[PDB]
Structures are given as structure tokens and as C-alpha cells.
Subunit: 347 residues, 4 copies
């Protein structure tokens, strides 16, 4: 049943030729589950790990991927509440040390010794992948594993970002880039949380897509010359919360300007080198808070997946084979491929 040989995309040298070759199957540890990855999502963090732009050293050779869904085919001799046949989801944090204030408090991502999938630990761009049982996401049975793969990163991130914004039901939330990949999920989650969504995006068929994902007010920045004034007129003042999915510095400056007094601006994107240069006087007088948000925790994962199971959050995805992931990586480096890409590891 469990084979000795599998196949996956592995890069031996940083910024080398990503190769799809036969690799040895991993053996699970005492606290690890062996998961047969069925579908894996492709993210820009994968391109980052391939280049080596982030400060942490990358274990080489390594198979990338940090959003993979599959079936628990193997289990360690210490795993507690898992069974063979259960749906498991590999996330960015592939485990950490359960003995420090950070982890004990729930922020196990800020653990000094944290394992990351597709960076420090072999990821989900293969057929069989191992994962820490405690950090593995419990995907409900009867769910399409191709549609839940995109929510294993984007979904949890946007959900935790709204929780960090600290809004009440009936409050206005401005989402920059609301008709994009991370923006659409944000709009849906905010609508399911009881917030009034205001979307600022510009393009063809973007307004329609926003209104078809439960959109309230859409600001087209291509047809609007002043975005701050528009947001301040549509929300009887500023928006109580502003989720910044746009990495542009100009966008974040406008975000600090069109936020409501005593409001929160949440930063999600991480373009290494960017600076949120804003007027301190404005923030101090209007008592504005700028919060940075990273990956979500175990509880956040559970809650976001529950919304997906209820059927309030959806992601239109395009499924391709694992044998074509090299060319997908090249198009991702060229910045041309559009849409959430999910890779079938079977073919």
C-alpha cells in the first residue's frame, strides 16, 4: 500500500532547474502523520523559497509547497486523535516546540524552533508528505480536497486579519484589491462575519465579480481620481477597519488616511523592502492603530474551515498536473499566471 518510490518537484540548488523526478517516500516520526497529498495549492511564497529572498536559510534539496490536502495513510506511535483515512491539511507551520511562552500563548509561529513546509521541511509538492500531528489541519470528510487546498493558507490569513482588525457586526471594512485572489476570500469572510464590505479595485469585470461575492460598495480606482474622498463619503466617515491586500506603498498611505477615527489598518502582504511612511500626527490625533498580521493558529484554522464547510466561502480554482509545476513556477516568476492554481499530485 505505502510505496517506496514517489514523485515530486525538487530543486537541489537555490534558483536552479525545478525537476520532477522519482524521490524516496518519507517515513513518519513518533508525532508525525504520513499524508498522501491529493491536491496542493501553489503560492508566491513557493517562488520566494526557490529564489532565497527571505532571510532564513533553506534546507536543500527540498520539495516546496505549504498548502496541501490529502488522506492520512500513515501515523506515528504517539499520534493521539488521528485515524487512518482522515483528511489532513499541511500548512505553512509544519510544527514547533511545545515548551515556550510564544507557543503556550498560541503564537507558535513566533516559536524560536519552528518548522516551515516547503522551506525548512519537505512540503506538499510531492505525493507522500509527513507533518506534525498537532499542527495538521483536520479537514471534514466528504469535502472536495481541491477546493479546500486554497483555503489552507489564503483563507486562514484573511480570517485572522479580520479578527485582528477587531470589527463589530454592522461595521464598515475597506478591502484594497477586493476582486483579487486574497481579496475575494476576504470579502466573503467579512460578509459571513456580519461586516459591511467596501471594495477598492480597478479592471474589467471586477465590479461585477465583487457584487457577485456579496459586495456592498465598489470604488473603481481607474475611474475615481480621489479614493480617500470616495471612501469617506460611502462610509459616513472612514471605514472602521482597512484590510491591505495591496502591497503598494501609495495604497497603504491612502489606507491610513481613509480609516475611521479609533480604527485599525491591518497589514497582510510582506514585500521585503517596503515602508509604510505615514504622518504620525494624524495617527496620534485620530488614535489610529496599524496592526501587522501573519499566519493563523490552530483555532483560527478550525474556524475558517468551518465557514468553508457551511458554504459561505468559495474559491474558483484551476486544476493542473504536478508534472507541469516547473512551467507554472516560470510563469509565476514572469508574473503572468492568473487565478488560484491547484496541482493534482496524482498525475
Amino acid at each position: 500500500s505505502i510505496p517506496e518510490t514517489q514523485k515530486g518537484v525538487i530543486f537541489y540548488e537555490s534558483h536552479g532547474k525545478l525537476e520532477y523526478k522519482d524521490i524516496p517516500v518519507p517515513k513518519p516520526k513518533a508525532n508525525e502523520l504520513l499524508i498522501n497529498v491529493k491536491y496542493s495549492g501553489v503560492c508566491h511564497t513557493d517562488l520566494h523559497a526557490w529564489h532565497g529572498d527571505w532571510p532564513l536559510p533553506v534546507k536543500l534539496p527540498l520539495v516546496g509547497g505549504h498548502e496541501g490536502a490529502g488522506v492520512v495513510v500513515g501515523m506515528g506511535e504517539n499520534v493521539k486523535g488521528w485515524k487512518i483515512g482522515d483528511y489532513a491539511g499541511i500548512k505553512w507551520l509544519n510544527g514547533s516546540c511545545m515548551a515556550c511562552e510564544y507557543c503556550e500563548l498560541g503564537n507558535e509561529s513566533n516559536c524560536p524552533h519552528a518548522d516551515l513546509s516547503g522551506y525548512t521541511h519537505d512540503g506538499s509538492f510531492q505525493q507522500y508528505a509527513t507533518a506534525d500531528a498537532v499542527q495538521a489541519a483536520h479537514i471534514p470528510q466528504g469535502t472536495d480536497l481541491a477546493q479546500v487546498a486554497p483555503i489552507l493558507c489564503a483563507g486562514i490569513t484573511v480570517y485572522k486579519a479580520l479578527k485582528s482588525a477587531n470589527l463589530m457586526a454592522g461595521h464598515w471594512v475597506a478591502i484594497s484589491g477586493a476582486a483579487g485572489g486574497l481579496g475575494s476570500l476576504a470579502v466573503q469572510y467579512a460578509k459571513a462575519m456580519g461586516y459591511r464590505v467596501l471594495g477598492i479595485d480597478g479592471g474589467e469585470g471586477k465590479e461585477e465579480l465583487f457584487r457577485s461575492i456579496g459586495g456592498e460598495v465598489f470604488i473603481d480606482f481607474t475611474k475615481e481620481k480621489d479614493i480617500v474622498g470616495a471612501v469617506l463619503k460611502a462610509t459616513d466617515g472612514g471605514a472602521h477597519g482597512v484590510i491591505n491586500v495591496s502591497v503598494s506603498e501609495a495604497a497603504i498611505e491612502a489606507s491610513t488616511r481613509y480609516v475611521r477615527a479609533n480604527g485599525t489598518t491591518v497589514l497582510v502582504g510582506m514585500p521585503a523592502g517596503a515602508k509604510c511612511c505615514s504622518d504620525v500626527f494624524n495617527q496620534v490625533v485620530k488614535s489610529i492603530s496599524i496592526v501587522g498580521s501573519y499566519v493563523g493558529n490552530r483555532a483560527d484554522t478550525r474556524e475558517a474551515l468551518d465557514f468553508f464547510a457551511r458554504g459561505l466561502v468559495k474559491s474558483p480554482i484551476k486544476v493542473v498536473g504536478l508534472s507541469t509545476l516547473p512551467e507554472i513556477y516560470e510563469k509565476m516568476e514572469k508574473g503572468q499566471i492568473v487565478g488560484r492554481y491547484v496541482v493534482d499530485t496524482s498525475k
Copy 2:
């Protein structure tokens, strides 16, 4: 009893010669109290009201001052819970429209129609001053009105700033400029709130004054070349909260680095023209929050004054007459003022 003539410092033109001449005494309105200011504090905000640097227009001619304590000598025909002989304190916010969204949630400072003392309303650099009965602070009886004058602005500000850091008892709080005017009150309030104080100031007799105000760890920035390392070694892996009383850009830039993961940095000073240009990657990964803090509300006033009454907060002040304020303003513009200054309106 209530005279018809009084004396105060009034400036007819912006940036003109401050004069000490006899002016008509104010008559109370329906919801206003007539207070006989006994002692008034001099702040750097008065120099700003004199120059016209801030954006709001100033009412001329006007008597400045926003921190004044005295006895209620007269009240209007609507004042509800005040009596003749009670001690009252005039603050920055001298009233607001109690009918809107902000004035109802407690943030009555963000009210569209707010009256500010020494800017839009006649202040307390006068013997008799009027104030809204709802925004006036209730100072307990038997208190020195000369020692409670400095706590009517600095005190409330630092207290709300330490309440905006979301800290728990036993947590580390770093205060930049801990041996200054605002920094000292901050240290005392944080010690009375159950926080471990770490002070970063440099000078002669500053370490001693910090250890004398219940200080726990002091970093001399004049004898230390790396402040971030020092803080991350003393406050274990960073300070849970950082109160920035220093207006220097370099200071706030270093503040965002010696903060613990998931911590908050509070901005109190407002040097119009300054910018907190920091790395976005760091804030998003460590999940740091930058919050701006302004003047406190009525509840905050009541709590801070209660600490002062218990006797856990003290301010060494120097008393001078009101006939000499015209020259104190010039020393304040030259930037030669060092300690807190309180003015006696009697002489």
C-alpha cells in the same frame, strides 16, 4: 464676591507680545461652571497655540492654558452634580456636542464640534475661567491644587497611553525618556499598574532619579552603543509594550525593533512633520501593533486622579507668578525649560 475685573495673559495677534492686562470676567452659560483658577500648568501646547503651527484656526483675542485647577465659584442653571466650593480642573477638551457617534462611545475628543481650552475657548491663564460641567474634572477636597495641575494633562495622557498598550501585570514596558517630564509620570503610573519598568534616558543624575521613582532597569543611551541589544537582553526577548515619549525619528525606529513579538508601540508625542518610516516585513511577521494615543476621556481622568489621591504618582514642580508668564513663554520658545512649571494666578 465674584468681581467684574480680572487679570490674565492675552495675545491679540498670533505670534504677538503676550500681555498681562485687566480683562472682563466671563459670565457662565447654562451648562458651564465659573471656576476661580488658583494654579495653572504651562505646557508646550501653549507655545503652539501662540505660533499657529497646528491646522485648526485660533479664536483671537484668547487667554491660553489647558491645565488649571481651582474652586467652583459660580454654576449655570442646568449644572447637575456640582456644588459651590468644589474643586474643579479645566482640561484640553472643554466640552463637545453630546449627540453624535464619537461623543457617545467615549471618544468625545474626535467630536466634529469640540471646544479646546486655550485654543478655541478662553483657557486658564486667567483668575476666573468658565468650563463645561460635564467635561470638568472632579478634584477631591483637601488636595494641593498646585501638585494636581501637572496631572491634568501629562498624567491622563501617560495613563491612557499605558492602557492602550494592552499590557498585563508582570509584563515589561519600555519608556523612552524615562527621566523627563512626561517619562517620569509614565514610570510612576506603570509601577502603580503592576508593570516592570525599563527606562532608556541619558544624562547626569537621571539613573538615580529613575531608581528613586521605583525604576527597575535603566539603559543609558550615552554609555550604550547598541540600545536594541541591551533591551532584548534585559526585558528577556523584548518589551511587551513601548511608550514613545521621545519625538525623535531614530528613537521610534529603534522602538519598533526592541518590542516583543505580538507587542504594541504607543505614540504620544506629535511633532507635525515627523514620520515613522519602519520596515513592514518585521511588523507583519512578528505581528507588532503601532497605536496612536491622544488626550484621555472622563473615566480615564477619574482613574488617574484616584492614583494621585492614593499617593502613588508625584510631580516635582516649580511655582511662579502669572505676572511672569510673558517671559516663561519666551524661555519655552528658546527651549531652555527643563522641569514642570506651575503658575500662581493669585500673584
Copy 3:
């Protein structure tokens, strides 16, 4: 325009014959608005003000009523933020000091000197009624004043009760009596706040009504012998929050039993003489919290009325004349009334 004679229901003696006679019109004070009540809601609290069951003494002769909507026809010489022609709503709290320790934190309903409508102050079972301008609710223009009258008490109460349960979006909330007058509004508000509603009521056409207002699971207590088991099975162990709109002791006991561990049970009804005798062991081991909720504050009023304006909360109610209120009171004392009753002060 403002007449000298009006008509209203007044009772000279406690438990006397309610009469509909011509009474002098009230003259506004300095901080009070003169509202021409157009529609007024009848509550069970009016029967209590008529009997004298509650502990506070009633001002006689008095015109009852605490939920009335109308137009501002006159205002005092201190009112700030109101205009002639604006829609105003009289609530239970109709006066405060607004300068104490409970009036400065928002809990102005616990103020030592609080004025209550229909108890200590003349209420809204009158054509012209006066009210404090700071506590009066701002009803948006273009709204049916007959449908917003029931939401000026029931609505705010249920909303604050759902905000006191400390629930998150996607959490389970059990409402006892979900097909009643205070239960239906609760279901609607909880659905608009993002909570999953579970209703426990028994009768004919109640399950259907629950499915029309937006309820998820319905437990018929007449067809179910074990309600605790049913709730623990419909949810994944119990309901995160339980709103008790039923005044029965048995119901509140079963409520403490079918709550999730670390959950909150909110008490809204007040049958003087009732008791929640529950096992202390259970509450201490499962860390359950029993919170009591009273009338809402000004912020809560605004938020609840905003939901009503968006159109997510509705109340099926009729409109009987004020000349027939003397008989509605008798039907209310007999306990034979169905639905929410609204009285037209014009007829």
C-alpha cells in the same frame, strides 16, 4: 402649532382606573426636547408601573409608556445637535447626571439619580412628551414610526444581551422562546450578527415562523422529552451562548445544563421572586458564566436602530388607538394578549 391641551392615559391612584382625559401640555426644560408622540409601544413594564410591584416609588399622577416615537416640535435653549422636524424616540432611561462614576462609563442606567419614563417621568402614552436631549434616540428620516416603536425597548434589550454573551461569528446561540415577542427579534439580531441560531419553543405554527425569520435548528419542547440532550446533539456539545427570554425556573436550570464549557448564559427577564438555584460544581468545573443584562446604552441604541434601517430586523405589529389603551391594560393583566401592540396617539 404647539397646543395647550392634549389627551393621554393617566392613573391618579396606584392600581386605579386608567382614564383617557384632557391634560395640560408639558413645557420643555433647558436640556429637554418636546416630542409629538405619533406611535407608542405597550410593554408588560407598564402593568408593573400600574400595580407598584417594583421597589422604587411612582410619581402620581403619571402617564405611562417607555417606548414612543415622534417628531421634535420644540427644544430647550441648551439642546445641541437636534433640529425641529427630526424623529426622536423616548426610551426607559429618560434622564441622568452624566457626571458620576456610572454615567461616565456608559452604564447611565445605574446612576443614583436616573429618570425613568412611565415610572418617575411622564411617559409616551400622551400626544406631547418631553425627554432629555442626550438620552433621546435619533431615528433616521423616512422610517415608519409605527414599526420602530417596538425596537426602542425589546430590540435594544436583545441586542445588548447578545453582546453580553461574548460570542464570535459562526458560534451557536440557543434562544429559549424563539417564536415569542422578545425571542423573534433576538433570532433576527443573532442571524444579522453572524451567529448560528437554535430555537427552543413549543406551539402551533411556531417552527414555521422560526424558519421564516432565519433560524437554523428548532427544538419543540412539547414533542421532545429531553431538551438538554437534544441541544447537546444539535450543537457539538452545547451552545456557546444561551439567551434566556423564558422567565421559568425550570428553563434557566436546563439552560445552565446545555451550555458549552466556557460559555455564557444571559438573563433578560426579571420576575421578582424567581431564583436560578443551579449546581455550583458544574459551573466551576465547566467554567460557565451567568451574566445579567438590563436596558442598553446610547451606543447600543444607535447600533440596533442601524440594523433596523438596513432592514435585517422586523416586528409584525398592529396599530390600535390610544382611546382603547384603558382596555388593552386589562387584557394585559389577564395575560390574554398575542403579538406586539402599538398605540396611535392621533386617534
Copy 4:
């Protein structure tokens, strides 16, 4: 060297003769540490496990004890974050599956398969004991293990109870039985958290011990006939929070009566069979919250032990050998035990 034989107090039958005989030494599992218990605290929960009064079944034969401190002499092949020679503390909750609703949110005490020390798992009333490495408390090096043993249960309980009252620094906290074993630690922790302590205990030399622990006001219930009036006069009203360390019903009733409006009453004691029969009208009108608190989590343990290390919490204890525990149990059943008892496992 780890021996093969040890000595401990084991009871084969429920309510049988506790014996001190040589028993086999436990072998650690994959995620468990082998601790050489040096000092162990005796609680009333041990007498409960001996009688079988609580509902859960006990694992016989069993060695009781839930508060034991010692050195890690052996660890499993999965333990991650511990070293040989580190000080470890065994608590009530040993270890549970970190995979459900209770573990992931921090409430790992409400887990379906939770292991309890001295009830379901062998406790610390022996020489060598095993414990889950994730639930074991990290005691700092250089600490007296005899003084930190009493703070491994009582301390954490009182700390979490004072954190469940939602109190601010400068607020009043009433502790019933402030001069007892669980009351003294409560007073000390509340003084270190910045709260004003009001103690209600009656006896000889109790007022002095309270004023020496850090208590502000003391109410002698033996010399006072009305306790509610006294607590309402000493706290300008009522206490913002009330920690009930007394198990009597009269005390808890008077507790709901002398709490401030919008305050919280925390229940810590668990006399199976008691009831807080209380008036519901009062709780609903004053918006009072009755919260139940159980054992603390990993984060709470860390924080409480940090206070003990700073030196702000102290417990006067009496050390006795383990060969005499068979008689201490009988004194505890007679209810004549005075002070906190700590047993030396060496003798």
C-alpha cells in the same frame, strides 16, 4: 542512576488503609518525563480521591498527589524543550490529546480524555513520577522546591480566578476568607496585580496576618453584624470583583449582594451539593456576572510562577516526611489540619 524500587503512599481499595510500601518505579513513555519528586503538597482533593465522592472513576491501585516539584532524571524519545537536571512541577492536569476544542483554545482541562494526577494517573506521593512534558511546569533553577510546591495548585487557581474577574489596577477586590490558605495567596497576588484588597475573615491573629500580607481594609465577621453594609461603606459602594474562597452558601449570597454594579463574582471552591440560590432581579438590574473558575492553563502557570520568582507571593509551610502521610490524611478527614502541608519524599 534511576533505581528499580521506590516508596510511596498507595491505596488498593477506595476508602481503604493508605500504606507506605515499596512499589515498582515507573518507566517514561515517548512524550513523558521521569521526575524525582523532592517535595509534594497535600490538598483536600487527595481526600476526595480517597473517598470517591467526585463522579469520575479512579484507577486503582493509585498513589495520590497533584502538587509535586522535583528534578527531571529521565525523558522520552520525543520530549522537545527539556534537559536532564531541570526542575519540573506535576499539576492536576497531567497531559491530554492536543487535538480537540478544549486543547487548541487553551482550555485543555475540558478535554474528553484528560489525565488527572492522583485520580487517573499515578500522582506525586512517591519518589519517582512520570508526567506529560507539554503540561509539566518549568520551575526556575535555584528555587526552594519546598516553597514552590504549594503554588503549583493554590497559586495558579487564585491567579486565574483574579484574571477571570476582569478587574483593572486601582479597583476594589473582596476576598472572603483572606487569612486562610487559599485566601492569603489570593491577597498577595491581587496586591502584586495592582488591586485594592478588602479581606473578610474572622478569628484571632487574622487581622494582623492580613495587614502583614498587604491587605488594605479588613472586615471581622465575628465583630460585625452586617457585612454587606460594611463592604458597601469601605468601597465607596461595592467591590468591583469578589473572589469566593469560602464554600458556605450564606457567604456566596452576601457576595452577590455587596458586589458593585457591573461587577463579577468568581466561584473557586467546589462543595459538590451546594447551590447559589440567589435573587435574579438584583443580578439583571445591576448587570452582575457570576463566573466559575477551575485549574489554570500553561500560560497561567508560567505567569504565576514568575510572580513567585520575583518574590511577591509567599506561603508559610510546614514540612513533614512521606512516612507520616498515612496519618496526615486522617487528620485531614477529621478537619483539624492547620496551615499548608508539604511532604518530603526523601524521608
